[PDB]
């Protein structure tokens, strides 16, 4: 008893394991852990959005943070600063040890695969398999989309170039259509107008080719926002298993 089974004594756990337990947690959240070189113990206190590692020094059967080691049981030390402010150890730490982590949350597990089990561990795999599926389809679509966007830009430049070609052949035809009607020379005017009607028709073809791409793009854009919508539905449920599942 005493230290070994206090709510806030986790001992076993590592540096990473604490950081997950103190994520976005209010100021005053704490746990005690075994030191990585076994004083023997480490306090991890939340202040200002950070996780403060404070050593507990064990010299001659007495505990504390610095050389006037007043306390003598660790539980005596930690409980002191549950009621008293930490400001009497370094003024900048005006906070109190307000919130334990508690190694009682929701079954003695982790001691003895599917054997030591099983229901919504398997549900995770399914939601995690689907999250994979969607995120893949999601990034493919995203890049698909980008390709179309640069294709639309390519069409715009293409059309612009073909538009210029009419503005080119009306500059050159206009002063030849009126030069050939001097010679009473038609049918030659017919060949000149044949090219005009190929070029004009070609512009409609390209313009339509783009428009077709445009209504495919906004359709994909709609499809993309949908993938995202479905993904943001699975994120805050995939984590709510991890919470129920592991601990």
């Amino acid at each position: 008893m005493s230290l070994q089974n206090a709510e806030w004594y986790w001992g076993d756990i590592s540096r990473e394991e604490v950081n997950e337990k103190l994520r976005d947690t209010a100021d005053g959240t704490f746990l005690v852990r075994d030191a990585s070189t076994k004083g023997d113990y480490t306090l991890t206190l939340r202040k200002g959005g950070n996780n403060k590692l404070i050593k507990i020094f064990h010299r001659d059967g007495k505990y504390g943070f610095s050389d006037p080691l007043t306390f003598s049981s660790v539980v005596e030390l930690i409980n002191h600063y549950r009621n008293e402010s930490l400001a009497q150890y370094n003024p900048k730490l005006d906070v109190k040890l307000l919130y334990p982590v508690s190694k009682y949350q929701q079954q003695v597990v982790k001691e003895d695969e599917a054997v030591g089990k099983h229901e919504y561990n398997t549900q995770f795999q399914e939601k995690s398999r689907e999250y994979d599926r969607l995120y893949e389809e999601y990034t493919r679509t995203s890049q698909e989309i980008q390709m179309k966007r640069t294709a639309i830009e390519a069409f715009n430049e293409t059309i612009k170039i073909f538009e210029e070609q009419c503005q080119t052949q009306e500059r050159y035809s206009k002063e030849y259509i009126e030069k050939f009607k001097r010679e009473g020379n038609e049918k030659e005017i017919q060949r000149i107008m044949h090219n005009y009607d190929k070029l004009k028709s070609r512009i409609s073809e390209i313009i339509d080719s783009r428009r077709r791409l445009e209504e495919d793009l906004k359709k994909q854009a709609a499809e993309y926002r949908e993938i995202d919508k479905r993904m943001n539905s699975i994120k805050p449920d995939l984590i709510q298993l991890r919470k129920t599942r592991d601990q």
Partner: protein, 1032 residues
């Protein structure tokens, strides 16, 4: 590398037209003539533009208005490329299928902007993989300033290249490939055992390409000048001649000749001792005779075309308050978002979360009210931060998101620099386009992500209002911060005692407690230690290597402390480049800190080591706040000083161009590099063409309904490679794996699609060097398209570094860190190691009996053959040595799921270790086969003397890497920036922190490792049954 590591014991996707991978053998192309008419011409897909034009103007004479046409040569083609630009094609030698056309059409114009040259440097566009001129109208002044201000660096580099015209230009193009230290480790020196070496020197004689040689025996520490001098003395012996004439001859012709390695483009252009050249040292290692080619300087110098660097087209007092006069607390107004993508299944609501950050964060971050129907994202509220504005550190930034977690009883993110590249504190209305959340992340904020608005405007878009004070607010100058530091240092001694941890300056001798410089970069520091360190900051200037720890002790949200830190940093003793690199990762955003780091590098990094850690230094460019900084200046300058450095600088930057969070920064950088690199751009363009054809080729084979039987895919491959456009593109260019290797003509018969799952390309080039095959090699590379090759790359780098540490401690363990280069989004090249086979391939061969009968002794039997008696001892030693190396590196790095197809052996006994993929978990092998090769004896080989020596190499090697943990921690740390799944956060690096003991003693570590190893378990699969599926 040189010899195939063979010891001599006896001594947005691409592709040809839009929507189509491969354009048909014949196609119709529309030609828009300048007289206004459109004529369709039937073209072969490999038709050059010269002949297409020739055809166009032939057939135009049949269409109306033919007389308004000028001569054939008065015009140039213009079209739209699938990158959406109007390209003018000046190189009419280019084939139709090579122009990256969007549509099969050309336009005929008269060359306007008549600066054929500036426009022609469209070669930059191609190398970069982006049209230069997308830059030309970006608008962001930071960008446009970067383009202008970085040209200085180009000018200096280009000048520092003509400082001594012919020689310094040679040095740039062919830099000495040399080790960092002249001093020669015992075991390597002892391979000479007189302190001298036998070298063969080759000369190509009068046009007959006849090859005389000269064998010289020379002191290993001779400069190239003196080897040449000894070559003169030899030749001159035969002619008799008087001494004095003999003496005058050497004296006046030494510096008239040049040494080249036979069979690759490496030169000995500098006065380093011979054995400091990586090739000579490697020769000693391999038990090879150095083959060098003797050559007149004039013949090298005459064939270095260079000169042209031109300054490009882009070469053209207000109200200012000081930041620390602003008397208010920091607040930021959150207006509204355009939209976020959630249905409303359950209105877990939307809120903007914000934080003020230094990578680690200067304050408690806050959310706005969950004021949301998701229908309308609107808050319109000022958020109040508990940090005084004057306390804001220079690299302060705001990191925000819109998200969700859930209450018992994500979404989109973005980062903003609170200061400009001009030191202006941001004020006024500001719109920010948000970024999609990274795959393996759910942290509400992502402060390690990039800074600035998402380029893609079709995204959620947050609107913010920053405070406006009477005028422009600026960060104070150093020449004012300094004054404030000195003032507050003067206040310290006037205090009475103080009862607060960040206390003092006598200084006691208990400060042996500052042997925590010895502790690794992720050892982490108690608050007591943070306060202890800061109290003694002045005694630290005597233990320079604590700087990173002290820096993590500083309160960055305190102007008083930060000012003092700048003072200390300003005249801090220099630290070894290894330690300086730590200071360029994400934990050290402050520009003063990084400036110090870059200054160490400018002073103590050899070009050798820069090459070794380039991968990391490129990555670290992403953590820089601003485009223009001292690290880009440093790297870019070295890249433009040393073409070997420059080459990989190019490919490391190019390989990430697809990544939009980095495109602009890297493209900009690449642009300045390409503009100033000189003639190598031409060689780079050849490499990019080659790679693009390969990418396009293996795309067809990978999707475009090509999943038929291997034989079918081989028919297609053989047809495509014979086509002239492919022949031209994939022959006669430098190897991106090592630019010193010329890749000549393909050997088509040797080129294959491998019949693995991944079916990569195996390509084979001739070596076009005069002294090649008969003295060096032919050239094999795997083209991998589909698998991310960055992990392999990193692993192979670490292996090379590991080998370095051991080899320089006189611990002779041989690794095989073969070439591997990622060149794009899951595209890469892998060096082929010749004369090697997988354990499996060996086991399957006869085993001097037949069929597929093996057993545990087969490996040893195979090596005993191949190294028939007397050379044998070497083979066993090489195997034992290399095996040890990989046994330890594998364990340290957590490279698991090894097996007999993962591990290869060479004819000479060397072992390695291919196809890495997975990293730190995300173990310990020793198969019985290997146990039997070490030793020779039967089932008893876990208690042989050979096994004990083997275990000793393992202990000694483990401890060596352990002693250099710090390098490795920092190397992995710098690599956190990229998109490696196995390296998303510091907690991933923790793995090697455990594998090497680190939080234990050397004595506890050795014991921990011993334990890991004396377990190990051994055995192996052997005909008996199920060596295929592994049943029992």
């Amino acid at each position: 590398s040189y010899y195939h590591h063979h010891h001599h014991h006896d001594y947005p996707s691409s592709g040809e037209l839009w929507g189509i991978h491969l354009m048909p053998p014949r196609i119709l192309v529309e030609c828009l003539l300048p007289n206004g008419m459109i004529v369709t011409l039937e073209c072969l897909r490999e038709a050059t533009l010269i002949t297409i034009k020739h055809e166009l103007f032939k057939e135009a004479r049949k269409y109306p208005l033919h007389q308004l046409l000028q001569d054939e040569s008065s015009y140039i083609f213009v079209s739209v490329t699938q990158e959406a630009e109007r390209e003018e094609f000046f190189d009419e030698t280019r084939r139709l299928c090579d122009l990256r056309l969007f549509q099969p059409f050309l336009k005929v114009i008269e060359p306007v902007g008549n600066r054929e040259e500036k426009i022609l440097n469209r070669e930059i566009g191609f190398a970069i993989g982006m049209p230069v001129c997308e830059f030309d109208m970006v608008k962001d002044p930071e960008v446009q300033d970067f383009r202008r201000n970085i040209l200085n660096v180009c000018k200096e580099a280009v000048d520092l290249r003509d400082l001594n015209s012919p020689h310094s230009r040679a040095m740039y193009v062919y830099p000495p490939n040399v080790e960092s230290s002249p001093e020669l480790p015992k075991h390597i020196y002892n391979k000479l055992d007189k302190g001298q070496i036998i070298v063969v020197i080759w000369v190509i004689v009068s046009p007959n390409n006849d090859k005389q040689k000269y064998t010289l025996k020379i002191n290993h520490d001779c400069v190239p000048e003196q080897v040449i001098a000894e070559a003169i003395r030899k030749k001159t012996r035969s002619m008799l001649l008087s001494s004095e004439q003999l003496k005058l001859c050497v004296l006046e012709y030494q510096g008239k000749y040049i040494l080249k390695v036979c069979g690759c483009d490496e030169y000995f252009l500098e006065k380093y001792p011979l054995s400091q050249y990586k090739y000579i040292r490697s020769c000693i290692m391999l038990g090879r005779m150095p083959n060098l080619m003797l050559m007149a300087k004039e013949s090298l110098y005459s064939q270095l075309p260079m000169d042209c660097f031109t300054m490009p087209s882009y070469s053209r007092e207000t109200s200012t308050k000081s930041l620390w006069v602003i008397n208010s607390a920091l607040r930021i107004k959150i207006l509204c978002a355009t939209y976020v993508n959630v249905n409303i299944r359950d209105i877990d609501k939307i809120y903007v979360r914000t934080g003020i950050y230094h990578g680690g964060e200067p304050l408690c971050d806050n959310v706005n009210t969950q004021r949301v129907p998701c229908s309308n994202p609107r808050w319109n509220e000022w958020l109040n931060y508990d940090i005084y504005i004057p306390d804001l550190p220079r690299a302060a930034r705001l990191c925000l998101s819109i998200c969700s977690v859930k209450g018992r009883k994500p979404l989109a993110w973005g980062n903003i620099n609170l200061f400009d590249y001009t030191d202006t504190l941001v004020s006024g209305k500001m719109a920010l386009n948000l970024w999609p959340v990274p795959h393996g992340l759910e942290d509400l904020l992502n402060p390690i992500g990039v800074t600035g608005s998402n380029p893609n405007k079709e995204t959620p878009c947050l609107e913010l209002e920053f405070d406006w004070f009477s005028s422009v607010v600026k960060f104070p100058d150093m020449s004012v911060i300094e004054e404030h530091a000195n003032w507050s240092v003067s206040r310290e001694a006037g205090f009475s005692y103080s009862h607060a941890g960040l206390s003092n300056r006598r200084e006691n001798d208990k400060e042996q407690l500052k042997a925590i410089s010895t502790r690794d970069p992720l050892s982490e520091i108690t608050e007591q230690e943070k306060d202890f360190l800061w109290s003694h900051r002045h005694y630290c200037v005597t233990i320079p290597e604590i700087l990173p720890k002290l820096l993590l002790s500083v309160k960055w949200n305190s102007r008083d402390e930060v000012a003092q830190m700048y003072c200390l940093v300003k005249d801090w003793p220099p630290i070894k480049p290894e330690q300086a690199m730590e200071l360029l990762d994400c934990n050290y955003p402050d520009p003063m800190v990084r400036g110090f780091a870059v200054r160490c590098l400018e002073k103590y990094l050899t070009d050798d080591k820069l090459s070794q850690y380039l991968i990391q230094l490129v990555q670290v460019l992403k953590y820089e706040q601003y485009l223009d900084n001292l690290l880009v200046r440093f790297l870019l300058k070295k890249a433009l000083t040393n073409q070997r450095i420059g080459h990989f600088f190019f490919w490391h930057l190019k390989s990430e161009m697809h990544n939009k969070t980095v495109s602009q920064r890297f493209g900009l950088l690449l642009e300045s590099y390409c503009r100033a690199c000189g003639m190598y751009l031409k060689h780079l363009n050849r490499q990019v063409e080659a790679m693009e054809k390969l990418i396009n080729l293996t795309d067809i084979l990978k999707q475009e309904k090509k999943d038929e039987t291997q034989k079918v895919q081989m028919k297609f491959l053989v047809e495509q490679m014979r086509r002239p456009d492919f022949m031209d593109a994939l022959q006669g260019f430098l190897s991106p794996l090592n630019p010193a290797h010329q890749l000549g003509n393909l050997r088509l018969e040797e080129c294959r699609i491998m019949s693995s799952a991944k079916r990569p390309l195996w390509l084979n080039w001739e070596n076009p060097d005069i002294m090649s095959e008969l003295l060096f090699q032919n050239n094999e590379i795997i083209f991998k398209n589909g698998d991310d090759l960055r992990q392999d790359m990193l692993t192979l780098q670490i292996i090379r570094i590991m080998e370095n540490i051991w080899q320089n401690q006189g611990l002779d363990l041989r690794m095989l860190p073969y070439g591997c280069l990622s060149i794009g989004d899951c595209v890469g090249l892998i060096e082929v190691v010749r004369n090697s086979h997988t354990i499996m391939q060996i086991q399957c061969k006869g085993g001097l009996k037949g069929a597929l009968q093996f057993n545990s002794h087969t490996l040893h039997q195979w090596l005993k053959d191949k190294n028939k008696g007397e050379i044998y001892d070497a083979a066993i030693d090489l195997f034992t040595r290399s095996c040890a190396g990989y046994c330890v590196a594998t364990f340290i790095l957590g490279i698991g799921d090894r097996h007999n197809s993962n591990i290869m052996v060479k004819d000479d006994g060397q072992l390695f270790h291919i196809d890495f993929g997975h990293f730190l978990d995300h173990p310990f092998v020793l198969t019985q086969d290997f146990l039997i090769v070490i030793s020779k004896g039967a089932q008893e080989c876990t208690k042989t003397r050979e096994f004990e020596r083997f275990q000793e190499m393992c202990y000694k090697a483990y401890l060596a890497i352990r002693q250099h943990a710090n390098l490795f921690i920092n190397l992995f740390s710098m690599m956190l920036g990229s998109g490696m799944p196995e390296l998303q956060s510091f907690d991933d690096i923790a793995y090697i922190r455990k594998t090497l003991a680190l939080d234990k003693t050397e004595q506890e570590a050795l014991e921990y490792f011993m334990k890991q190893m004396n377990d190990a378990r051994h055995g192996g699969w052997t005909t008996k049954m199920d060596w295929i599926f592994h049943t029992i």
